[PDB]
Amino acid sequence: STALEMASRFVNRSPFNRWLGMSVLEAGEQGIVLGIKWREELISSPEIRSTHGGILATLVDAAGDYAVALKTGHPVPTMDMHVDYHRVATPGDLRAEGQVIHFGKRFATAHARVLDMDGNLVASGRALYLIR
Amino acid sequence: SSTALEMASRFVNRSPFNRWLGMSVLEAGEQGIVLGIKWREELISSPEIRSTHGGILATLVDAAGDYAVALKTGHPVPTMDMHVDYHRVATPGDLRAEGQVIHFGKRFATAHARVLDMDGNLVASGRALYLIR
Amino acid sequence: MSSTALEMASRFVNRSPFNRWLGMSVLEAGEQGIVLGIKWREELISSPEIRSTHGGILATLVDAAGDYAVALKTGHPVPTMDMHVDYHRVATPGDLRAEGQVIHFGKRFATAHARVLDMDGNLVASGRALYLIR
Amino acid sequence: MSSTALEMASRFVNRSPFNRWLGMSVLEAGEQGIVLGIKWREELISSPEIRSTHGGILATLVDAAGDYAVALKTGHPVPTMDMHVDYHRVATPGDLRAEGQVIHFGKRFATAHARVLDMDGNLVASGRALYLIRA
Numbered sequence: 001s002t003a004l005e006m007a008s009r010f011v012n013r014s015p016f017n018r019w020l021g022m023s024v025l026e027a028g029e030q031g032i033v034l035g036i037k038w039r040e041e042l043i044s045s046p047e048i049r050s051t052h053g054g055i056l057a058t059l060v061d062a063a064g065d066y067a068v069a070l071k072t073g074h075p076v077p078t079m080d081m082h083v084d085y086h087r088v089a090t091p092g093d094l095r096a097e098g099q100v101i102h103f104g105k106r107f108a109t110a111h112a113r114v115l116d117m118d119g120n121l122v123a124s125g126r127a128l129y130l131i132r
Numbered sequence: 133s134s135t136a137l138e139m140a141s142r143f144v145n146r147s148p149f150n151r152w153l154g155m156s157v158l159e160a161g162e163q164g165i166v167l168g169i170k171w172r173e174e175l176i177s178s179p180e181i182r183s184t185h186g187g188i189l190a191t192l193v194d195a196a197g198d199y200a201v202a203l204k205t206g207h208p209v210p211t212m213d214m215h216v217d218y219h220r221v222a223t224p225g226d227l228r229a230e231g232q233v234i235h236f237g238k239r240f241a242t243a244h245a246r247v248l249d250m251d252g253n254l255v256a257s258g259r260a261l262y263l264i265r
Numbered sequence: 266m267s268s269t270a271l272e273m274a275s276r277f278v279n280r281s282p283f284n285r286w287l288g289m290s291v292l293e294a295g296e297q298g299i300v301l302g303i304k305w306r307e308e309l310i311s312s313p314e315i316r317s318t319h320g321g322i323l324a325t326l327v328d329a330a331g332d333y334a335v336a337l338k339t340g341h342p343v344p345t346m347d348m349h350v351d352y353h354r355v356a357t358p359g360d361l362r363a364e365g366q367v368i369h370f371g372k373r374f375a376t377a378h379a380r381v382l383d384m385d386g387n388l389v390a391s392g393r394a395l396y397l398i399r
Numbered sequence: 400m401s402s403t404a405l406e407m408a409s410r411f412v413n414r415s416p417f418n419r420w421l422g423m424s425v426l427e428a429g430e431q432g433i434v435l436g437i438k439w440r441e442e443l444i445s446s447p448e449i450r451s452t453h454g455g456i457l458a459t460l461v462d463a464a465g466d467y468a469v470a471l472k473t474g475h476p477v478p479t480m481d482m483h484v485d486y487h488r489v490a491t492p493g494d495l496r497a498e499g500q501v502i503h504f505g506k507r508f509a510t511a512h513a514r515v516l517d518m519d520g521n522l523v524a525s526g527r528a529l530y531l532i533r534a
């Protein structure tokens with residue numbers, strides 16, 4: 001609630017997030033849940049109408065970032081990121097769940113799951129952030 | 133070659149996201165691929181340093197490795213997984229992505245990529261595994 | 266969890282000379298996933314200043330845990346395609362534990378996650394890996 | 400030159416009991432980066448049917464190559480933040496070479512890439528790693 005408000009503010013600061021219609025669905029002790037709204041510009045392969053792998057990477061990076069932000073009180077730079085692609089993401093809205101896995105004095109690690117509308121896992125990933 | 137450059141442009145322009153990125157092919161040959169994209173305000177992550185979103189750099193790492201593999205296969209290829217290192221903040225400006233195939237197997241390939249800004253500064257690098265299929 | 270899972274994984278673990286050198290064993294095996302243990306030895310050391318366990322050993326643990334967690338589902342050990350490992354804390358001299366878990370299980374590929382713990386239950390490393398099912 | 404570099408890297412390599420157990424040596428060291436070798440042993444084996452070298456060994460090589468490529472620039476070995484390794488080919492029984500080189504070198508962080516080769520020069524694995532300049 002406090003955490004949800006704080007996360008929303010962070011999310012709305014970024015023009016890319018806004019272009020993605022990104023929102024906060026949940027925030028608290030279990031990390032963060034994000035949503036984005038689908039548009040035709042997201043499409044990678046026109047024949048399968050698949051959402052671009054980089055959009056999914058965005059969601060992994062965002063989920064981990066703002067999940068760390070719940071602990072720091074501010075958004076954090078990404079050092080590096082890994083993303084696994086599991087299923088093709090057909091046209092529709094997406095959810096990214098983000099949890100902090102390690103929180104040190106200067107670095108944090110977060111994990112993320114990206115889910116489709118039926119709750120199928122389409123991608124997962126992890127990232128290292130800088131605490132500054 | 134011009135045939136390589138030809139083929140790659142065609143692949144690049146299939147994708148609506150590529151086109152929204154103003155993505156173009158700068159070079160294509162035995163040396164791999166070089167891509168460009170055109171900056172726009174919607175790319176911005178932190179409004180105060182005007183940095184290009186990390187997901188955009190990842191897109192570029194993914195695209196460069198994809199289309200570099202595609203030069204060898206003749207068709208675009210699905211990404212299995214990807215890694216990206218962020219080295220410098222990318223301030224507003226067009227970006228270049230260089231992709232090369234590192235391993236070309238019978239069913240998979242891995243490519244490495246570098247993302248450069250307008251002064252040729254390295255801003256990000258990465259690798260990815262692709263499914264031939 | 267299972268005794269059949271425990272017997273199966275235990276057989277898989279003991280097939281490897283490197284696992285045996287590491288004194289690797291199966292602590293837990295079942296539906297949730299797998300837990301492995303290794304026995305510390307002086308040869309594992311990276312830095313003699315801090316007597317730290319080499320990061321290559323921590324990565325070996327991430328790959329093993331993921332492999333055997335996949336293996337509980339396929340019925341056989343699996344080749345690794347790639348892996349990522351994150352290092353959080355120095356693993357000082359002491360036995361280590363690795364928890365493995367299957368994240369996605371397709372007909373042809375599987376992804377697993379791991380956590381490497383010290384004897385006090387502090388997380389020293391974590392990671393993920395892609396495996397091929399053939 | 401590539402003599403002070405060799406001797407410096409050699410000192411770093413031999414400081415580790417795990418490196419010594421692996422029979423690790425420095426083959427090349429200079430401005431372009433580092434080349435390491437290890438000696439094969441039966442204990443290295445993963446699959447006894449294939450007689451494949453364990454992937455943990457190949458990952459140790461990615462990490463070592465990168466660390467010592469950075470160390471040639473800092474003057475000291477460096478801790479690893481994280482690592483990725485890609486496995487391309489089975490490493491059958493035999494000695495292995497690892498080439499390491501720095502990709503980005505910053506105030507506080509450095510990134511390095513590695514290639515693991517068999518005795519015929521086939522690429523067995525590759526990967527990258529992030530290091531902390533400090534400890």
